[PDB]
Amino acid sequence: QESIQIPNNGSAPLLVDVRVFVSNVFNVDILRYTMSSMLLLRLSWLDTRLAWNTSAHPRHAITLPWESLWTPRLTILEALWVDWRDQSPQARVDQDGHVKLNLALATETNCNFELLHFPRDHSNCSLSFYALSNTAMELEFQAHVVNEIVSVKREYVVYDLKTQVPPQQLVPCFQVTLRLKNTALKSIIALLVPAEALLLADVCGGLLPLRAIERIGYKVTLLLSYLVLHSSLVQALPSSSSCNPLLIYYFTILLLLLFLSTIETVLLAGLLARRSWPETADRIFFLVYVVGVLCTQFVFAGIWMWAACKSDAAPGEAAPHGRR
Amino acid sequence: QESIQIPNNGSAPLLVDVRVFVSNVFNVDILRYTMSSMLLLRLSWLDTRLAWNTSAHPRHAITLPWESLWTPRLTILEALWVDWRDQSPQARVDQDGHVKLNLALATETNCNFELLHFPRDHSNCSLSFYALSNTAMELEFQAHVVNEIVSVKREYVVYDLKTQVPPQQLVPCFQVTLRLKNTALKSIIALLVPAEALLLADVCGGLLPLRAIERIGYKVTLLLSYLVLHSSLVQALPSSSSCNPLLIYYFTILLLLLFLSTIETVLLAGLLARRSWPETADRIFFLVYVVGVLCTQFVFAGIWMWAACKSDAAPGEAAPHGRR
Amino acid sequence: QESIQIPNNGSAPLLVDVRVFVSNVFNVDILRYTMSSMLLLRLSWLDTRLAWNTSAHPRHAITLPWESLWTPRLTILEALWVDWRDQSPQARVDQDGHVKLNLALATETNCNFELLHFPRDHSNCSLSFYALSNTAMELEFQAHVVNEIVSVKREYVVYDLKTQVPPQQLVPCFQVTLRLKNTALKSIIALLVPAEALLLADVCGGLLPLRAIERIGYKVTLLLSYLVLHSSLVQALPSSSSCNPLLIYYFTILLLLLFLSTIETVLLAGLLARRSWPETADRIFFLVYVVGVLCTQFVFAGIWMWAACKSDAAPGEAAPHGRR
Amino acid sequence: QESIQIPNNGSAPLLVDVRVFVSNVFNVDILRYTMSSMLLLRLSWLDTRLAWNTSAHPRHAITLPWESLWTPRLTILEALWVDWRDQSPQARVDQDGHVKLNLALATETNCNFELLHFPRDHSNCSLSFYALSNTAMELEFQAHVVNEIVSVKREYVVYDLKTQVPPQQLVPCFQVTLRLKNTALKSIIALLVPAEALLLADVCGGLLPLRAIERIGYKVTLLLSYLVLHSSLVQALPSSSSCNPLLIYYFTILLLLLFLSTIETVLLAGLLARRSWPETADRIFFLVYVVGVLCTQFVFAGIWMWAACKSDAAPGEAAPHGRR
Amino acid sequence: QESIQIPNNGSAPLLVDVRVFVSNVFNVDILRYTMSSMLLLRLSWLDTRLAWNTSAHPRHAITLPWESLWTPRLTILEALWVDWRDQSPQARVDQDGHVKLNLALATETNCNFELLHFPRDHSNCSLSFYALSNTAMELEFQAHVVNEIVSVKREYVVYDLKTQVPPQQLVPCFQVTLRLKNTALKSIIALLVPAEALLLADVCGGLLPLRAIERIGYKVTLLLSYLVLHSSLVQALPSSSSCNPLLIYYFTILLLLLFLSTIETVLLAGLLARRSWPETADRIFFLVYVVGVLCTQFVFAGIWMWAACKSDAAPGEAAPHGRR
Numbered sequence A, B, C, D, E: 001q002e003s004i005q006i007p008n009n010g011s012a013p014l015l016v017d018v019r020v021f022v023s024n025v026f027n028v029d030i031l032r033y034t035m036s037s038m039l040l041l042r043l044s045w046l047d048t049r050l051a052w053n054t055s056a057h058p059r060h061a062i063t064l065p066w067e068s069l070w071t072p073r074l075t076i077l078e079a080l081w082v083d084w085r086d087q088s089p090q091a092r093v094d095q096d097g098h099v100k101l102n103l104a105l106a107t108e109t110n111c112n113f114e115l116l117h118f119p120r121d122h123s124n125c126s127l128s129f130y131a132l133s134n135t136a137m138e139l140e141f142q143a144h145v146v147n148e149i150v151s152v153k154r155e156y157v158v159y160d161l162k163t164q165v166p167p168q169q170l171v172p173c174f175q176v177t178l179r180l181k182n183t184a185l186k187s188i189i190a191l192l193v194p195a196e197a198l199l200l201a202d203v204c205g206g207l208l209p210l211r212a213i214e215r216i217g218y219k220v221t222l223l224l225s226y227l228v229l230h231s232s233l234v235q236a237l238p239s240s241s242s243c244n245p246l247l248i249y250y251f252t253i254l255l256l257l258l259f260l261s262t263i264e265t266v267l268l269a270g271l272l273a274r275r276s277w278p279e280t281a282d283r284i285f286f287l288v289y290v291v292g293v294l295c296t297q298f299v300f301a302g303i304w305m306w307a308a309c310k311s312d313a314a315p316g317e318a319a320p321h322g323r324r
């Protein structure tokens, strides 16, 4: 049973060199705050107990089953689910005792997206592999990442990849940090351009005379269209506890502006039906409304240019598992 | 085969210290009344039969497979499904016989959400781990919970976590109770603000003269928009047997008010077309309608401020499994 | 290999006492005609071959792996999928030879819902456990059910639970029958109240004069709203081969009535535009339409009060597997 | 290791009698072209090597694990996924050597639906079980099917079931062919009746005078309603490479007719606004439109009565695996 | 343990002949950029260590379990998930030592669809099988593909299949490349024909006089219908980082044209209400709008005829795993 035990690197902990190949990052669900990825881990260590003389055995390398020798058991804390593409992996041992193990796994990890600037947002996704059954005094990790992503035409593009071994760790672990950027024009074309078009159409329709019956129906139809579009947008966007996307606030402000315009039009048309004062009031309101729309657009642009979130470090992030 | 048997702590039952780290609570489906979480259980006990002399073996700790020694089999009653992130877990045994076992599991448990005050509701979710194959006379649990949640910007935020071992239990068990609060602005912005805006727009449109043809079409378009919004809300909200959310009742009342306003407008316009009496009736109805809308808003606010549900304890909750 | 063999209860078949605890019934999908449940089965039998003298071994109870002794293999015929929450269950054997086995399983079984009276329908769901590898001459089942349901605020409520062992069976089996009732107000509030409101609004709008241009647009907008609502309802309701819900027929009749009203209004307005005869015809049609709506409501209420379906027993239900 | 080897039936191949019980056919997804079913396979063969004298052993039947004796490994080619409801099945061996094995499996196989006459279409679904590891010179299959379907009130009803062993096969296989018919009224009530109602409403609205302003808005609202309904239908129906359903073509033709009517109405109203000639043209177009609608309905009925598809045999269907 | 080791083909690497039968390609999700397929791999090699004399054993072929002999472990890099339809496959060994292994697997691989010309696009999907545990100096692959697809009436049709073993590989691998073409008329009929119909209807409605009140409402209703259709299309189409489909750009241009037409109509009607100059401006704008619509259609047709994407090779595609 001594074979299952971790090899002893004298006083120093055993060093395991891990190479991570990120094959693909396919599902990035902002609503579920999860990112799905595919990884290949090549773990290399030295096990002098498995070394054999070349005279007795002429093979320069042998293959052993997963449970026939010590292999680190990696667990991902942020991963909702992990699917290992080999239920019975085989480790490879050289004549000098070097052991190499290849593991292909598809995971759905947790990513804290910074959706403040949706749909142009940069997020950091961390995949932390822990050797829970071992301690840092026995196991040490040396992690490298290779960018082997096979899909590039997706909405979210991975542009920065790094690996790091956090210090002051009791449980040996290594984390791969990747940076995700959104380059999808679907949201903009689908919702932002039609929303601005509807807002400009309402502003233009403000020039219709108060006594025109067609003014009311046109405004109400625009309001209904914007209500449908706003419902679609908010259903298509997640809600954060602290920093919701500025897009939903901007759309809510525009919806309130459209409601205010429609309500003013209806109220003044009713008062007129009951140059008179309501017509002058309507003209003044139209000017104030145009000025307010321009001011709102400028204010939203300024907020987008200069925005930040302190947010709050999660208890897992503030106090990582197996520290100190 | 004696190794598989549970260790004997003399007359007293064996004590197992369980530490639970809640890594994340990601899916909280109100429609399915289920909450999905990720947990790490560290179970520590003492097995003097596994102790070895340090002279014979110089290793201070060894690793054994899952089935090579006694390990408690934990089962979650409320969990729809449990996925263990290690099909072949390894227990760690010290030279003194202390055994530590780490198990990472993603579960989808059942939570009875108190959706009366949606979208601002506080719910209690209980995850009960039972050792069905054992009895309380042989196994005893000591549970502690560590808040290591890695996601904080989700709609539902866990703010209170506790562990408790219910008394008078035949089957040894321990339950982790967490408190879930909803901090999502998606529902409010998506549906409550547009609903109030539509209600105020209808109230304002009540001032349109009865003889105005544009009055009818405007009211009907508002009614159609509110019908779409109400259908979306009710489809997006679950139905409870006893205490449905007050939001659906409030929206139904508002929809009935809009239908009443539209029906009155159409009826009086038709009667007038066939200061006359219909105009006076329309003015009186408009005043009564405004007063009724204000009264309804105040009544709903008062109900929200002072509401409660006796509800009913479920048979599983009233009579937990393995009691007495 | 004799341990794996079923114990011999002399000439009579071996008796296995099964206790079923229904922890929860969470998914009840009318569209898929499936019901998802969670069960705990405690199977107790007597195996004198496993009895041991208390002098040789002081343990009063031992635990054995799943494959180390004979354990009945239960299969559910109606279950779309079964997930056992313990891949390596352990049986418990007393010193007298009594064996107790606990199995927690989440299943998605097939339920033939009687959706004639949707959304107030009572259905019977049967979960049949068969020991396919055994015969009735060797294995006998004694089943009891304990109501330990942990969720009570769901749309569907289980109110009656029973267990029965069908007679004249070749393959030993036992079935748990539960009664499901629908107490969800979501469907009613979402679709029935708005449909009746739209119907009453159309009836009231029938009083608009034929020469009023606003009459046509109002009717068409109501027709469009009812078309959307009807499409939503029919998409949200399953279709049965024999007895479709009366709700879809009632909504189809109401939709046809609305189409007839709109078509009559348009036809008579066109004829008038080309007390004149069209106005008298419109008044007579309005009276006939109101009478017909009242008669249709009364007829639907009477049908709901007195309705039944002979339906047809399925081949599996008429001829259960392993009978005679 | 000779026990694992297939028994030798002299020169002739070993004969395995397979009885298939179709418990249920639950998911029939036309969009995915897949059919989900549940089957119980009872495989009986003769293994004289397992026969034992009744004097040495008094048991008339024994149970053996899945891997302790030769059992054919059945694979389904058309099955997207197969879930075996017993990870460790047990075979039953009599004293004479007869071996019976029961396997319960839920599969999602591929069915080539003939959706030309949707929603009244008849399709053939074939489930082919192959013994890939064996050859026809060693293994022979004798398949029978028993109709034990437990669900009868679903949209799709299985009415014909057969089993056949294709000739000139190298890999021994047997296929179960079932006939699926659609008896769902959901599609008709949801979409066909409203579409015909909208078409008749548009035809009736054609009688509105050209100078009536209400004519244009009514036509456009009907056009919008039909656009929504058409989008819903096409989204709810799959697209075939060769024979798309005639329903989508019929709805496209009706949509084009509605667009033509609306465009003609708008064009002639504009020309008139700029008995005059446009009124005569509108009357002639209305007559031609009514005649064309009737002719289109008759032509569609005739096409439905007399329609066929040569289609094309798939490479798998034309050249089945393991033939010749 | 020497049996598990890879056979030695002298100095040259061992040659494994792989035959791939593509049973079906069922799910082609453009939104997820994934393609789901079903494959049967027949791997044949020579293992002289397993050869036996025909005199000692009369069997001409034997079956061995998966782990009783060396079998290459194939891993798919692009596959999101792989489901092997046989958890315990059996290899077949002849008397001469030839070993044949049949593996049926359903995979969901990653395909980089060239969605520029949606819905008529040709894509290349590559399924790469790697023997990670082995090196090219020991293992060599010879791959052949057989077109045994059983489904032909799906939206996406596979018309070209090839296999290739990339040169200069360290890890032995072979990739199957298939060509996917879209033959679905669902998208065209659902969205392109209605969009062109709406555009032509708006062009025709441009002839309505500026003083006609019905002109504004008709234009706004067409705009709302096109907004709904555009939202449906963009929701139904994925967004690419580099080359989004030209269809979304064309629909955005048409939506902008409709917004411009509606805004111009409203502005000029308002100015006129406040042959006059606005009428002449409206006529000139109508002519310019018709010319612009024709020019836009011609430009889009020309772009469709002559379009290309340089795009960018993904890091995995540019530098395949296990090269050099």
Ligand SMILES: *[C@@H]1O[C@H](CO)[C@@H](O[C@@H]2O[C@H](CO)[C@@H](O)[C@H](O)[C@H]2NC(C)=O)[C@H](O)[C@H]1NC(C)=O
Residues within 6 Å of the ligand: A009, A012, A013, A014, A015, A016, A045, A046, A142
């Ligand atoms: C045993 O421990 C020593 C020290 O920790 C390891 O030597 C280090 O190896 C890394 C290679 O990545 C070097 O960067 C360090 O500079 C080395 N440090 C020293 C003091 O030599 C050694 O690799 C370990 N051996 C095994 C088999 O784990």
Ligand SMILES: *[C@@H]1O[C@H](CO)[C@@H](O[C@@H]2O[C@H](CO)[C@@H](O)[C@H](O)[C@H]2NC(C)=O)[C@H](O)[C@H]1NC(C)=O
Residues within 6 Å of the ligand: B009, B012, B013, B014, B015, B016, B045, B046, B142
């Ligand atoms: C054996 O039983 C005794 C008594 O139940 C256990 O002693 C208790 O340990 C806990 C530590 O959490 C203390 O809080 C109690 O005060 C102790 N009670 C007594 C009477 O000492 C003991 O831990 C058990 N030992 C094992 C290996 O299970």
Ligand SMILES: *[C@@H]1O[C@H](CO)[C@@H](O[C@@H]2O[C@H](CO)[C@@H](O)[C@H](O)[C@H]2NC(C)=O)[C@H](O)[C@H]1NC(C)=O
Residues within 6 Å of the ligand: C009, C012, C013, C014, C015, C016, C045, C046, C142
């Ligand atoms: C062996 O067979 C006998 C008879 O079938 C069983 O005795 C029955 O046990 C049940 C308890 O549920 C009683 O209700 C019956 O009245 C008993 N019948 C008789 C004739 O005694 C006995 O339980 C079986 N023993 C085992 C180990 O299976």
Ligand SMILES: *[C@@H]1O[C@H](CO)[C@@H](O[C@@H]2O[C@H](CO)[C@@H](O)[C@H](O)[C@H]2NC(C)=O)[C@H](O)[C@H]1NC(C)=O
Residues within 6 Å of the ligand: D009, D012, D013, D014, D015, D016, D045, D046, D142
């Ligand atoms: C061995 O081979 C013979 C011939 O193939 C089998 O005998 C046949 O059994 C079937 C029963 O379904 C009959 O319909 C045939 O008429 C029989 N043919 C002959 C020539 O007898 C026999 O069943 C096989 N035995 C085993 C154990 O597989």
Ligand SMILES: *[C@@H]1O[C@H](CO)[C@@H](O[C@@H]2O[C@H](CO)[C@@H](O)[C@H](O)[C@H]2NC(C)=O)[C@H](O)[C@H]1NC(C)=O
Residues within 6 Å of the ligand: E009, E012, E013, E014, E015, E016, E045, E046, E142
């Ligand atoms: C051992 O290596 C030799 C050479 O690589 C293999 O011989 C080749 O087999 C293929 C058959 O597909 C031929 O196309 C080549 O022309 C052969 N080359 C030579 C030099 O003979 C041989 O197949 C390998 N044997 C085994 C068991 O792997």
Ligand SMILES: *[C@@H]1O[C@H](CO)[C@@H](O)[C@H](O)[C@H]1NC(C)=O
Residues within 6 Å of the ligand: A114, A122, A123, A124
């Ligand atoms: C993401 O990582 C980069 C450094 O790699 C850091 O500068 C940045 O602040 C991080 N952003 C967030 C939201 O954590």
Ligand SMILES: *[C@@H]1O[C@H](CO)[C@@H](O)[C@H](O)[C@H]1NC(C)=O
Residues within 6 Å of the ligand: B114, B122, B123, B124
């Ligand atoms: C939830 O738990 C707290 C105490 O932890 C208790 O006060 C409260 O009543 C509980 N609420 C419900 C709905 O059970």
Ligand SMILES: *[C@@H]1O[C@H](CO)[C@@H](O)[C@H](O)[C@H]1NC(C)=O
Residues within 6 Å of the ligand: C114, C122, C123, C124
């Ligand atoms: C359901 O079961 C009860 C008895 O338990 C029976 O009276 C009733 O007829 C059954 N209903 C159906 C639809 O089978």
Ligand SMILES: *[C@@H]1O[C@H](CO)[C@@H](O)[C@H](O)[C@H]1NC(C)=O
Residues within 6 Å of the ligand: D114, D122, D123, D124
């Ligand atoms: C289906 O099977 C029947 C015979 O069982 C055959 O007559 C019919 O042509 C088949 N239809 C198709 C589409 O294959």
Ligand SMILES: *[C@@H]1O[C@H](CO)[C@@H](O)[C@H](O)[C@H]1NC(C)=O
Residues within 6 Å of the ligand: E114, E122, E123, E124
């Ligand atoms: C796809 O493969 C063919 C050759 O098989 C090649 O000509 C074509 O350029 C490839 N297309 C893409 C987008 O890679």
